[PDB]
Amino acid sequence: HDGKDDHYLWDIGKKKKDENSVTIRQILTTSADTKELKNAGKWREFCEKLGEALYLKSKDMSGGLKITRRILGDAEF
Amino acid sequence: DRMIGKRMSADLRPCHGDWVEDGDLSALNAYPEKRLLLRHPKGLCPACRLFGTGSYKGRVRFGFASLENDPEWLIPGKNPGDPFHGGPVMLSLLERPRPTWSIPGSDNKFKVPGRKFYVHHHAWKTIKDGNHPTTGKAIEQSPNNRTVEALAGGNSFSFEIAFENLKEWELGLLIHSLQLEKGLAHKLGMAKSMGFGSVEIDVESVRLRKDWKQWRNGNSEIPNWLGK
Amino acid sequence: NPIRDIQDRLKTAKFDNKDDMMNLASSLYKYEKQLMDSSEATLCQQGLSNRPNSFSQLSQFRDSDIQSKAGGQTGKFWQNEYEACKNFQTHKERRETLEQIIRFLQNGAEEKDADDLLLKTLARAYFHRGLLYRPKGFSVPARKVEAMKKAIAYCEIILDKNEEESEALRIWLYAAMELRRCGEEY
RNA sequence: UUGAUGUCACGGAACAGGAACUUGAACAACAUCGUUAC
Numbered sequence A: 001h002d003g004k005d006d007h008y009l010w011d012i013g014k015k016k017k018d019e020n021s022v023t024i025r026q027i028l029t030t031s032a033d034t035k036e037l038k039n040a041g042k043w044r045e046f047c048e049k050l051g052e053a054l055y056l057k058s059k060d061m062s063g064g065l066k067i068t069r070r071i072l073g074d075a076e077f
Numbered sequence B: 001d002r003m004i005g006k007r008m009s010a011d012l013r014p015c016h017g018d019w020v021e022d023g024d025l026s027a028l029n030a031y032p033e034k035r036l037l038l039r040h041p042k043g044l045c046p047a048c049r050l051f052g053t054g055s056y057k058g059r060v061r062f063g064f065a066s067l068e069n070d071p072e073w074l075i076p077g078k079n080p081g082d083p084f085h086g087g088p089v090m091l092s093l094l095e096r097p098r099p100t101w102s103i104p105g106s107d108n109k110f111k112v113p114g115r116k117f118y119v120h121h122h123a124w125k126t127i128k129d130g131n132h133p134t135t136g137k138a139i140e141q142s143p144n145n146r147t148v149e150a151l152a153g154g155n156s157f158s159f160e161i162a163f164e165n166l167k168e169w170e171l172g173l174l175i176h177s178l179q180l181e182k183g184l185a186h187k188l189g190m191a192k193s194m195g196f197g198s199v200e201i202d203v204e205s206v207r208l209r210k211d212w213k214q215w216r217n218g219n220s221e222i223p224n225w226l227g228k
Numbered sequence C: 001n002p003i004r005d006i007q008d009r010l011k012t013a014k015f016d017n018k019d020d021m022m023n024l025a026s027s028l029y030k031y032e033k034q035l036m037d038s039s040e041a042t043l044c045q046q047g048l049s050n051r052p053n054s055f056s057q058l059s060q061f062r063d064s065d066i067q068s069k070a071g072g073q074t075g076k077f078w079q080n081e082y083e084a085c086k087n088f089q090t091h092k093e094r095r096e097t098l099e100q101i102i103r104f105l106q107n108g109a110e111e112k113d114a115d116d117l118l119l120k121t122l123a124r125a126y127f128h129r130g131l132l133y134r135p136k137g138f139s140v141p142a143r144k145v146e147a148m149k150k151a152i153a154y155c156e157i158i159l160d161k162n163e164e165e166s167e168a169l170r171i172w173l174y175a176a177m178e179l180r181r182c183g184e185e186y
Numbered sequence D: 001u002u003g004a005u006g007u008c009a010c011g012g013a014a015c016a017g018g019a020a021c022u023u024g025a026a027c028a029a030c031a032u033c034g035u036u037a038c
Helices: A024-031 A040-059 B168-178 B219-227 C004-011 C020-036 C051-063 C074-086 C091-105 C116-129 C142-158 C168-180
Strands: B088-090 B147-149
Touching: B168 B219, C004 C020, C004 C051, C020 C074, C074 C091, C074 C116, C091 C116, C116 C142, C116 C168, C142 C168
Parallel strands: none
Antiparallel strands: B088 B147
């Protein structure tokens, strides 16, 4: 809301010491132009499988009882 | 040593509040039993039952109030023949309130006082002319104050409040809180400590809901609810 | 009503016997299971009374369990849940409780740390759900057949380590004797 | 990687149920900084 480069999500990892510490904006900024992710088809799968890996890592960060989505009705006749 | 949350009685702290004790709650973060260490062991106060909270929807809805007459500004604008824009007025410094003047000491004797209600007076006749309220000197255009456009006294707005599943005494107290007595007045807006902002609210018709068909204007039950 | 019980169990928790720890885990599981679906006991918006003592006890319970995740908590709770499910009235509530058990404990049986009680009660839930399938096509529905097959698969998961069990072997034979009369092969 | 005298698989809708909702006046007055002297 101030206009500076301090977001609460896209700027995690920025400290006062060793100001070369990378943030998520810099990582996504240097990966959007790597001469192999320059066409449309190669960027789509990159974002898809990166999001899939982050979801798989976020899933098992709970402690309560976890319900499954849909496990019943596999009728194969 | 203690935070400001432990400087008042434990019954006046907000229910569904925060963690002020010494241990860190972030350890019980991935478990559902964490939320029970942040609520009061008795329930919800009378104001977190009409107005909502987190994990409970409130049952009173306000609305946008609209003007009905012509504006009638405070300072006439620079473009004549245009009765839809006012003139500017420069305010004073208006900076942050210190809470180390109501709690002066540091040990245990100094608790937290009440709720800081501003008083009604007439000190805008000195701002409108360009002077300071304390000293009589002029106001400079420093890069720390504001230049606003303000309405004058004598306007009339109109709004509407919807409510559901209220008791009788809750409606009586809400009407007592909307319309005050004959000599009193509310306060809203900016720069409340300089006289600016003094409204008075009157209550027009009240319509109830009997069934899904009829609605039964209930104006004849107000002197009951109030007393109740 | 489900929040006063947590505190009643937290008052006299001795952190040494395997009965009060089990009762505390049962109360926590029942409160969470009450929250997952939206019952009428969701309007209770109170909390726990003695904050620092209760925080110490709950952190010590969630900390002095991670070295003893032997499956002694959830297995016994779902065992008693199924045991209460068996002796019910009309089939509607039995069907709903069976599908809720199946949905809740299907995840915790896919690892190496798989208890024998957990797999045993999951196979019994599949077998008992396989009997309550109302036909509608002048023929047997395929979901009954695959419930029987899943029960066989889990009882084979248990009996792969041991040889005789006298409890899982009977479930295996019940599933086979049920597959025989549904027009299938042994 | 088929076997012959006999293939309706173009013989079969991945279909069916779930309010991104709840809570929040764009508001404001008392200082800041540490040492000097016997």
